[PDB]
């Protein structure tokens, strides 16, 4: 069972110049102190990535999917519970759903049991207790199941001074759905458009299911009452380019530079 | 003969650190010289004659 | 079978060439012209299955 939102006061989507995030390991091999050049799907430097800020008011519209999604979230509260991807149409078509709340990471691919809304009630007035665990009602036929160990999702956190910054990248290539993850532990800086630096994206999981995806929406949690918190996340797209990467003595990616971005590049 | 890798040389113990997803090791010549034994999980270093 | 077999099903009514490793299970009604139609067969109303 699920209950709709209504009275949607959608904030204007902000824009942020993504500095250096998005570089990942192209393949599961090892190199050592050698430069490399690779043509690959990427997010370029200095692109106006879309910033969504969530403060009674919920703002999570459905967004079209095109050539992977680079998603980032700086939070502590553990409101995110998964992602809805595909071409759902009240789940009479094929889609996939993700649940990674507390017990395990489960990925289902089905002509789903469906709700009319992402959340459930949503919540009662003061606390954020979870009830009505079924987020899905009735299906025709299902295709694929996957259950694995839960990821590092600390439950509940202070408003402001967020440390849980997690960057995921979603890639689709001919039925290969590759998800790469990287979480950084602490950021003492207050949430702004500031964070820039060096990072690497270790690979996480690959799914050979072979479906069609055209749009996606997030998953965040019978009364209407809540003391508002703070949530900040970013969504951006990708296109094929070629990158020059510098390795190190240990065997990790230190710096990457675009080739078609600038004449100096 | 490592999973179809048919080669010849001397095998030493490699002190470098790989990753759980990592399985091989290359060089400028793009030929394999650092490998991982499937049964026992240390790292071997390959050097030609 | 000795009297014929009819259990297995298919469809040869698709609009365009699907990309490799694409799954289609839905039974959207096949159309041959710009006239919208559904359900019973006829002109631009042929069932795909
Ligand atoms: C796979 O997904 C694409 C979207 O990425 C869909 O494209 C549709 O193609 C038909 C072909 O005439 C159009 O009529 C639809 O309008 C398209 N959809 C949208 C949302 O615009 C479609 O679901 C799939 N395409 C193929 C070729 O299999
Ligand atoms: C939510 O909206 C859908 C739209 O059709 C409706 O069917 C459903 O009953 C609504 N649920 C609630 C709890 O209002
Ligand atoms: C830069 O951000 C503005 C803000 O609305 C947007 O209109 C524009 O498309 C963005 N440009 C690029 C290249 O992302
Ligand atoms: C909030 O209300 C729901 C019913 O809508 C109830 O199930 C839940 O126990 C209530 N929680 C609190 C903390 O009052």
Short mmCIF file of C-alpha atoms and ligand atoms in Angstrom, two decimals:
data_model
loop_
_atom_site.label_atom_id
_atom_site.label_comp_id
_atom_site.label_asym_id
_atom_site.label_seq_id
_atom_site.Cartn_x
_atom_site.Cartn_y
_atom_site.Cartn_z
CA UNK A 1 0.00 0.00 0.00
CA UNK A 2 1.17 3.52 -0.85
CA UNK A 3 -0.24 7.03 -0.32
CA UNK A 4 0.34 9.92 -2.73
CA UNK A 5 2.00 13.24 -1.86
CA UNK A 6 -0.13 16.14 -3.24
CA UNK A 7 0.54 19.91 -2.92
CA UNK A 8 3.85 19.66 -4.77
CA UNK A 9 5.94 22.79 -4.15
CA UNK A 10 8.80 21.90 -6.48
CA UNK A 11 11.95 23.93 -5.90
CA UNK A 12 13.86 25.25 -8.93
CA UNK A 13 16.60 22.72 -9.75
CA UNK A 14 19.94 24.26 -8.89
CA UNK A 15 23.06 24.00 -11.03
CA UNK A 16 26.60 23.26 -9.87
CA UNK A 17 29.89 23.10 -11.78
CA UNK A 18 31.03 19.51 -11.22
CA UNK A 19 34.79 19.83 -10.86
CA UNK A 20 36.53 16.44 -10.98
CA UNK A 21 34.10 13.71 -9.90
CA UNK A 22 33.17 10.77 -12.12
CA UNK A 23 36.45 8.99 -12.93
CA UNK A 24 36.32 5.22 -12.44
CA UNK A 25 38.48 2.18 -13.10
CA UNK A 26 37.80 1.14 -16.72
CA UNK A 27 38.66 -2.54 -16.23
CA UNK A 28 39.67 -5.02 -13.53
CA UNK A 29 43.41 -5.02 -14.20
CA UNK A 30 46.48 -3.65 -12.43
CA UNK A 31 48.98 -1.06 -13.63
CA UNK A 32 51.87 0.67 -11.87
CA UNK A 33 53.26 4.20 -12.40
CA UNK A 34 52.30 4.32 -16.08
CA UNK A 35 50.27 6.89 -17.99
CA UNK A 36 47.30 5.62 -19.96
CA UNK A 37 44.79 6.91 -22.51
CA UNK A 38 41.34 5.35 -22.76
CA UNK A 39 38.21 6.11 -24.78
CA UNK A 40 35.24 5.58 -22.49
CA UNK A 41 31.89 6.96 -21.38
CA UNK A 42 32.50 9.79 -18.93
CA UNK A 43 31.19 12.91 -17.24
CA UNK A 44 33.36 15.87 -18.30
CA UNK A 45 34.85 18.42 -15.96
CA UNK A 46 32.99 21.71 -15.40
CA UNK A 47 29.44 20.66 -16.25
CA UNK A 48 26.28 22.12 -14.70
CA UNK A 49 25.14 19.07 -12.75
CA UNK A 50 21.61 19.29 -11.34
CA UNK A 51 21.32 19.95 -7.59
CA UNK A 52 18.23 18.82 -5.68
CA UNK A 53 17.70 20.01 -2.10
CA UNK A 54 15.05 18.43 0.13
CA UNK A 55 14.04 20.29 3.28
CA UNK A 56 5.69 18.50 4.79
CA UNK A 57 7.43 19.32 1.51
CA UNK A 58 8.71 16.44 -0.63
CA UNK A 59 10.31 17.04 -4.04
CA UNK A 60 11.31 13.98 -6.10
CA UNK A 61 10.01 14.12 -9.69
CA UNK A 62 10.69 11.46 -12.28
CA UNK A 63 13.63 12.21 -14.57
CA UNK A 64 14.50 10.83 -18.02
CA UNK A 65 17.38 8.38 -18.34
CA UNK A 66 20.04 8.89 -21.01
CA UNK A 67 23.44 7.17 -21.21
CA UNK A 68 24.01 6.35 -17.55
CA UNK A 69 23.53 8.52 -14.47
CA UNK A 70 26.15 10.00 -12.16
CA UNK A 71 24.46 10.40 -8.77
CA UNK A 72 25.92 11.90 -5.61
CA UNK A 73 24.43 12.36 -2.15
CA UNK A 74 25.71 14.19 0.92
CA UNK A 75 23.62 13.14 3.90
CA UNK A 76 23.42 11.43 7.29
CA UNK A 77 19.71 10.64 7.70
CA UNK A 78 19.39 7.42 5.61
CA UNK A 79 16.13 8.39 3.92
CA UNK A 80 17.17 6.87 0.56
CA UNK A 81 16.01 3.28 0.11
CA UNK A 82 16.71 2.53 -3.56
CA UNK A 83 16.01 3.61 -7.12
CA UNK A 84 13.18 3.06 -9.59
CA UNK A 85 14.47 2.72 -13.16
CA UNK A 86 12.93 1.88 -16.50
CA UNK A 87 9.78 2.55 -18.55
CA UNK A 88 7.31 1.49 -15.86
CA UNK A 89 3.81 2.65 -16.97
CA UNK A 90 2.25 1.42 -13.68
CA UNK A 91 4.51 -1.67 -14.01
CA UNK A 92 2.64 -3.26 -16.91
CA UNK A 93 6.02 -3.06 -18.69
CA UNK A 94 9.40 -4.38 -17.58
CA UNK A 95 11.37 -2.46 -14.96
CA UNK A 96 13.76 -2.97 -12.04
CA UNK A 97 13.55 -1.88 -8.40
CA UNK A 98 16.19 -1.57 -5.67
CA UNK A 99 15.77 -1.93 -1.89
CA UNK A 100 18.86 -1.46 0.29
CA UNK A 101 17.45 -0.14 3.56
CA UNK A 102 18.73 -2.18 6.51
CA UNK A 103 18.79 -5.95 6.01
CA UNK A 104 20.18 -6.59 2.51
CA UNK A 105 20.61 -5.13 -0.96
CA UNK A 106 17.88 -6.67 -3.13
CA UNK A 107 17.46 -5.95 -6.84
CA UNK A 108 14.30 -7.18 -8.56
CA UNK A 109 13.56 -7.07 -12.29
CA UNK A 110 9.91 -7.63 -13.10
CA UNK A 111 6.64 -6.45 -14.58
CA UNK A 112 6.21 -5.29 -11.07
CA UNK A 113 3.83 -5.13 -8.24
CA UNK A 114 3.44 -1.36 -8.09
CA UNK A 115 2.33 1.62 -6.04
CA UNK A 116 1.02 4.98 -7.17
CA UNK A 117 3.66 6.79 -5.08
CA UNK A 118 7.26 6.19 -3.94
CA UNK A 119 6.70 6.46 -0.18
CA UNK A 120 4.02 4.79 1.94
CA UNK A 121 2.09 7.08 4.33
CA UNK A 122 4.58 8.99 4.56
CA UNK A 123 5.44 9.24 8.29
CA UNK A 124 3.87 10.08 11.61
CA UNK A 125 4.36 13.48 13.20
CA UNK A 126 7.56 13.25 15.26
CA UNK A 127 9.63 10.16 14.49
CA UNK A 128 10.65 8.39 11.27
CA UNK A 129 9.40 4.90 12.11
CA UNK A 130 8.89 2.50 9.21
CA UNK A 131 5.57 0.71 8.68
CA UNK A 132 3.60 -0.87 5.80
CA UNK A 133 6.72 -2.56 4.47
CA UNK A 134 5.11 -3.65 1.18
CA UNK A 135 6.07 -1.02 -1.42
CA UNK A 136 4.48 -3.13 -4.15
CA UNK A 137 0.95 -4.45 -4.72
CA UNK A 138 0.19 -6.72 -7.71
CA UNK A 139 2.09 -8.10 -10.72
CA UNK A 140 1.69 -10.27 -13.81
CA UNK A 141 5.08 -11.99 -14.16
CA UNK A 142 8.61 -11.45 -12.84
CA UNK A 143 12.02 -12.06 -14.42
CA UNK A 144 15.06 -11.68 -12.15
CA UNK A 145 16.02 -11.65 -8.46
CA UNK A 146 19.26 -10.69 -6.73
CA UNK A 147 20.04 -10.58 -2.99
CA UNK A 148 23.37 -9.50 -1.50
CA UNK A 149 25.02 -8.08 1.61
CA UNK A 150 23.80 -4.62 2.70
CA UNK A 151 26.00 -1.61 2.04
CA UNK A 152 27.36 0.88 4.60
CA UNK A 153 24.18 2.84 5.36
CA UNK A 154 24.28 4.41 8.82
CA UNK A 155 20.75 5.01 10.08
CA UNK A 156 19.82 8.56 11.25
CA UNK A 157 22.08 11.59 11.61
CA UNK A 158 22.39 15.19 12.70
CA UNK A 159 20.92 18.01 10.62
CA UNK A 160 23.89 19.80 9.08
CA UNK A 161 27.62 19.00 9.20
CA UNK A 162 26.94 15.99 6.97
CA UNK A 163 29.71 13.44 6.51
CA UNK A 164 28.09 10.66 4.44
CA UNK A 165 29.03 11.62 0.87
CA UNK A 166 28.41 8.70 -1.49
CA UNK A 167 28.98 8.84 -5.26
CA UNK A 168 27.49 6.18 -7.53
CA UNK A 169 27.63 5.89 -11.31
CA UNK A 170 25.11 3.86 -13.32
CA UNK A 171 26.16 2.53 -16.73
CA UNK A 172 24.10 0.66 -19.32
CA UNK A 173 25.83 -1.07 -22.24
CA UNK A 174 23.95 -3.76 -24.23
CA UNK A 175 22.41 -5.31 -21.14
CA UNK A 176 25.49 -4.79 -18.94
CA UNK A 177 24.24 -2.62 -16.07
CA UNK A 178 27.36 -1.68 -14.13
CA UNK A 179 27.11 0.24 -10.87
CA UNK A 180 30.29 1.72 -9.39
CA UNK A 181 30.44 3.15 -5.87
CA UNK A 182 32.68 5.28 -3.68
CA UNK A 183 31.89 6.63 -0.20
CA UNK A 184 34.06 9.15 1.60
CA UNK A 185 33.85 9.08 5.41
CA UNK A 186 34.05 12.67 6.73
CA UNK A 187 33.49 16.17 5.35
CA UNK A 188 33.71 18.83 8.07
CA UNK A 189 32.60 21.51 5.60
CA UNK A 190 28.96 22.65 5.66
CA UNK A 191 26.87 21.56 2.63
CA UNK A 192 27.49 23.96 -0.26
CA UNK A 193 28.65 23.79 -3.88
CA UNK A 194 32.23 23.86 -2.55
CA UNK A 195 33.49 20.17 -2.53
CA UNK A 196 36.25 19.62 -5.10
CA UNK A 197 39.27 17.35 -5.08
CA UNK A 198 40.70 14.01 -6.14
CA UNK A 199 38.74 10.77 -5.94
CA UNK A 200 38.46 7.35 -7.56
CA UNK A 201 35.42 5.16 -8.17
CA UNK A 202 35.94 1.50 -7.35
CA UNK A 203 33.65 -0.91 -9.22
CA UNK A 204 30.79 -2.42 -7.23
CA UNK A 205 28.45 -4.66 -9.24
CA UNK A 206 27.44 -5.78 -12.75
CA UNK A 207 24.02 -7.04 -13.84
CA UNK A 208 23.52 -8.97 -17.14
CA UNK A 209 19.72 -8.72 -17.34
CA UNK A 210 19.20 -7.04 -20.73
CA UNK A 211 16.24 -4.66 -20.44
CA UNK A 212 15.28 -1.20 -21.77
CA UNK A 213 15.46 1.93 -19.60
CA UNK A 214 14.16 5.40 -20.52
CA UNK A 215 13.51 7.20 -17.20
CA UNK A 216 14.24 6.92 -13.50
CA UNK A 217 13.04 8.14 -10.10
CA UNK A 218 14.47 7.90 -6.60
CA UNK A 219 13.03 6.12 -3.54
CA UNK A 220 12.64 8.03 -0.28
CA UNK A 221 10.23 7.66 2.62
CA UNK A 222 -1.20 7.69 7.09
CA UNK A 223 -0.78 11.08 8.76
CA UNK A 224 0.98 14.22 7.47
CA UNK A 225 3.51 15.61 9.94
CA UNK A 226 7.30 15.93 10.09
CA UNK A 227 10.01 18.18 11.53
CA UNK A 228 11.94 19.17 8.42
CA UNK A 229 15.55 18.09 7.94
CA UNK A 230 18.21 18.66 5.31
CA UNK A 231 19.08 16.51 2.29
CA UNK A 232 21.32 17.33 -0.67
CA UNK A 233 21.93 15.28 -3.79
CA UNK A 234 23.05 15.77 -7.38
CA UNK A 235 22.25 14.08 -10.69
CA UNK A 236 24.12 14.33 -13.99
CA UNK A 237 24.59 12.59 -17.32
CA UNK A 238 27.46 11.21 -19.40
CA UNK A 239 28.74 11.03 -22.97
CA UNK A 240 31.63 9.18 -24.66
CA UNK A 241 35.00 10.95 -24.55
CA UNK A 242 38.62 9.95 -24.06
CA UNK A 243 40.65 10.48 -20.89
CA UNK A 244 44.31 10.48 -19.90
CA UNK A 245 44.90 8.87 -16.50
CA UNK A 246 48.00 8.94 -14.30
CA UNK A 247 48.62 5.93 -12.06
CA UNK A 248 50.81 5.73 -8.96
CA UNK A 249 53.26 3.36 -7.28
CA UNK A 250 50.55 1.63 -5.23
CA UNK A 251 48.31 1.07 -8.24
CA UNK A 252 45.49 3.58 -7.82
CA UNK A 253 44.15 6.35 -10.03
CA UNK A 254 45.60 9.70 -8.96
CA UNK A 255 44.61 12.22 -11.65
CA UNK A 256 42.55 12.16 -14.83
CA UNK A 257 42.28 14.79 -17.56
CA UNK A 258 39.92 15.18 -20.51
CA UNK A 259 41.17 15.41 -24.09
CA UNK A 260 38.39 17.26 -25.95
CA UNK A 261 37.60 19.77 -23.19
CA UNK A 262 40.27 22.47 -23.60
CA UNK A 263 43.11 23.16 -26.05
CA UNK A 264 45.53 22.65 -23.16
CA UNK A 265 43.74 19.36 -22.50
CA UNK B 1 49.23 -22.74 -17.61
CA UNK B 2 47.02 -20.33 -15.65
CA UNK B 3 43.46 -20.60 -17.04
CA UNK B 4 44.75 -20.69 -20.61
CA UNK B 5 47.74 -18.41 -19.94
CA UNK B 6 50.47 -20.63 -21.37
CA UNK B 7 53.86 -19.09 -20.61
CA UNK B 8 57.41 -19.83 -19.51
CA UNK B 9 59.56 -18.21 -16.85
CA UNK B 10 60.49 -17.94 -13.20
CA UNK B 11 57.94 -17.30 -10.46
CA UNK B 12 58.71 -15.24 -7.35
CA UNK B 13 56.57 -13.84 -4.53
CA UNK B 14 55.27 -10.38 -5.42
CA UNK B 15 55.16 -7.78 -2.65
CA UNK B 16 52.76 -5.39 -4.39
CA UNK B 17 49.15 -5.09 -3.23
CA UNK B 18 46.23 -5.83 -5.55
CA UNK B 19 42.47 -5.31 -5.11
CA UNK B 20 39.67 -7.89 -4.65
CA UNK B 21 38.40 -7.24 -8.18
CA UNK B 22 41.94 -7.18 -9.61
CA UNK B 23 43.32 -10.38 -11.14
CA UNK B 24 46.24 -9.55 -13.48
CA UNK B 25 49.17 -7.18 -13.95
CA UNK B 26 50.65 -5.57 -17.06
CA UNK B 27 53.53 -3.29 -18.05
CA UNK B 28 54.54 -0.99 -20.91
CA UNK B 29 54.74 -4.02 -23.22
CA UNK B 30 51.16 -4.97 -22.15
CA UNK B 31 52.24 -8.52 -21.33
CA UNK B 32 51.24 -10.24 -18.10
CA UNK B 33 53.93 -10.40 -15.42
CA UNK B 34 52.03 -10.36 -12.10
CA UNK B 35 49.37 -13.02 -11.52
CA UNK B 36 47.13 -14.38 -8.77
CA UNK B 37 47.07 -18.11 -8.03
CA UNK B 38 43.40 -19.25 -7.91
CA UNK B 39 43.89 -21.81 -5.12
CA UNK B 40 46.22 -20.02 -2.69
CA UNK B 41 45.65 -16.29 -2.66
CA UNK B 42 49.16 -14.83 -2.75
CA UNK B 43 50.61 -12.85 -5.67
CA UNK B 44 53.13 -14.33 -8.10
CA UNK B 45 55.64 -12.36 -10.16
CA UNK B 46 56.65 -13.66 -13.60
CA UNK B 47 60.12 -12.99 -15.01
CA UNK B 48 61.40 -14.39 -18.33
CA UNK B 49 64.56 -16.44 -18.70
CA UNK C 1 1.53 -34.07 -32.29
CA UNK C 2 -0.43 -36.53 -34.42
CA UNK C 3 -3.28 -33.99 -34.63
CA UNK C 4 -1.04 -30.91 -34.72
CA UNK C 5 0.43 -28.65 -32.05
CA UNK C 6 -0.86 -25.23 -31.02
CA UNK C 7 0.61 -24.53 -27.56
CA UNK C 8 3.75 -22.65 -28.66
CA UNK C 9 3.29 -18.98 -29.53
CA UNK C 10 5.19 -16.20 -31.29
CA UNK C 11 4.69 -12.90 -33.13
CA UNK C 12 5.93 -11.61 -36.49
CA UNK C 13 4.28 -8.18 -36.16
CA UNK C 14 6.88 -5.69 -34.92
CA UNK C 15 7.59 -2.19 -36.18
CA UNK C 16 11.39 -1.90 -36.14
CA UNK C 17 14.55 -3.90 -35.54
CA UNK C 18 15.16 -4.40 -31.83
CA UNK C 19 18.62 -3.94 -30.33
CA UNK C 20 20.53 -7.11 -29.33
CA UNK C 21 19.51 -8.82 -26.07
CA UNK C 22 16.19 -6.96 -25.84
CA UNK C 23 13.19 -8.62 -24.18
CA UNK C 24 9.59 -7.95 -25.25
CA UNK C 25 6.70 -9.66 -23.43
CA UNK C 26 3.96 -7.04 -23.71
CA UNK C 27 1.05 -7.50 -26.11
CA UNK C 28 0.66 -4.00 -27.54
CA UNK C 29 -1.71 -4.21 -30.51
CA UNK C 30 0.03 -4.26 -33.89
CA UNK C 31 -0.79 -1.38 -36.23
CA UNK C 32 -0.25 -1.17 -39.99
CA UNK C 33 -1.52 2.37 -40.60
CA UNK C 34 -2.09 5.73 -38.95
CA UNK C 35 -5.69 4.85 -38.01
CA UNK C 36 -5.83 4.00 -34.28
CA UNK C 37 -7.42 0.65 -33.50
CA UNK C 38 -7.50 -2.02 -30.80
CA UNK C 39 -9.24 -5.23 -29.84
CA UNK C 40 -11.13 -6.74 -32.77
CA UNK C 41 -9.23 -7.28 -36.03
CA UNK C 42 -9.72 -5.50 -39.33
CA UNK C 43 -8.01 -2.72 -41.27
CA UNK C 44 -4.97 -1.67 -39.18
CA UNK C 45 -6.25 -3.87 -36.33
CA UNK C 46 -4.34 -7.15 -36.70
CA UNK C 47 -3.43 -8.95 -33.48
CA UNK C 48 0.32 -9.55 -33.03
CA UNK C 49 0.18 -12.94 -31.30
C1 LIG D 1 13.66 1.33 -25.74
O1 LIG D 1 13.53 2.57 -25.03
C2 LIG D 1 13.31 3.70 -25.88
C3 LIG D 1 13.60 4.94 -25.07
O2 LIG D 1 14.99 5.04 -24.76
C4 LIG D 1 11.87 3.64 -26.38
O3 LIG D 1 11.77 4.33 -27.62
C5 LIG D 1 10.43 4.37 -28.15
O4 LIG D 1 10.48 4.10 -29.56
C6 LIG D 1 9.20 4.09 -30.22
C7 LIG D 1 9.47 3.73 -31.67
O5 LIG D 1 8.55 4.37 -32.54
C8 LIG D 1 8.52 5.44 -30.07
O6 LIG D 1 7.23 5.39 -30.67
C9 LIG D 1 8.40 5.79 -28.59
O7 LIG D 1 7.85 7.10 -28.45
C10 LIG D 1 9.76 5.74 -27.91
N1 LIG D 1 9.63 6.02 -26.49
C11 LIG D 1 9.71 7.25 -25.97
C12 LIG D 1 9.54 7.35 -24.48
O8 LIG D 1 9.90 8.24 -26.67
C13 LIG D 1 11.38 2.19 -26.50
O9 LIG D 1 10.71 1.81 -25.31
C14 LIG D 1 12.52 1.20 -26.78
N2 LIG D 1 13.03 1.36 -28.14
C15 LIG D 1 13.36 0.33 -28.92
C16 LIG D 1 13.86 0.68 -30.29
O10 LIG D 1 13.26 -0.84 -28.55
C1 LIG D 2 -2.97 7.82 -5.37
O1 LIG D 2 -3.27 8.21 -6.72
C2 LIG D 2 -3.74 7.14 -7.55
C3 LIG D 2 -3.92 7.72 -8.94
O2 LIG D 2 -4.76 6.90 -9.74
C4 LIG D 2 -5.03 6.56 -6.98
O3 LIG D 2 -5.43 5.45 -7.76
C5 LIG D 2 -4.81 6.12 -5.53
O4 LIG D 2 -6.04 5.70 -4.96
C6 LIG D 2 -4.24 7.27 -4.70
N1 LIG D 2 -3.98 6.84 -3.34
C7 LIG D 2 -4.29 7.58 -2.27
C8 LIG D 2 -3.95 6.98 -0.94
O5 LIG D 2 -4.83 8.68 -2.37
C1 LIG D 3 24.63 25.69 -17.12
O1 LIG D 3 23.62 25.96 -16.13
C2 LIG D 3 22.50 26.67 -16.67
C3 LIG D 3 21.60 27.02 -15.51
O2 LIG D 3 20.22 26.92 -15.87
C4 LIG D 3 21.81 25.81 -17.73
O3 LIG D 3 20.72 26.53 -18.29
C5 LIG D 3 22.80 25.42 -18.82
O4 LIG D 3 22.19 24.51 -19.73
C6 LIG D 3 24.05 24.79 -18.22
N1 LIG D 3 25.04 24.52 -19.25
C7 LIG D 3 25.68 23.35 -19.36
C8 LIG D 3 26.66 23.24 -20.49
O5 LIG D 3 25.47 22.42 -18.59
C1 LIG D 4 1.64 7.16 13.28
O1 LIG D 4 0.39 6.82 12.65
C2 LIG D 4 0.38 5.53 12.02
C3 LIG D 4 -0.96 5.39 11.33
O2 LIG D 4 -1.10 6.35 10.29
C4 LIG D 4 0.62 4.46 13.08
O3 LIG D 4 0.65 3.18 12.44
C5 LIG D 4 1.93 4.72 13.80
O4 LIG D 4 2.10 3.78 14.86
C6 LIG D 4 1.97 6.14 14.37
N1 LIG D 4 3.27 6.41 14.96
C7 LIG D 4 3.45 7.24 15.99
C8 LIG D 4 4.87 7.40 16.47
O5 LIG D 4 2.52 7.84 16.51
#
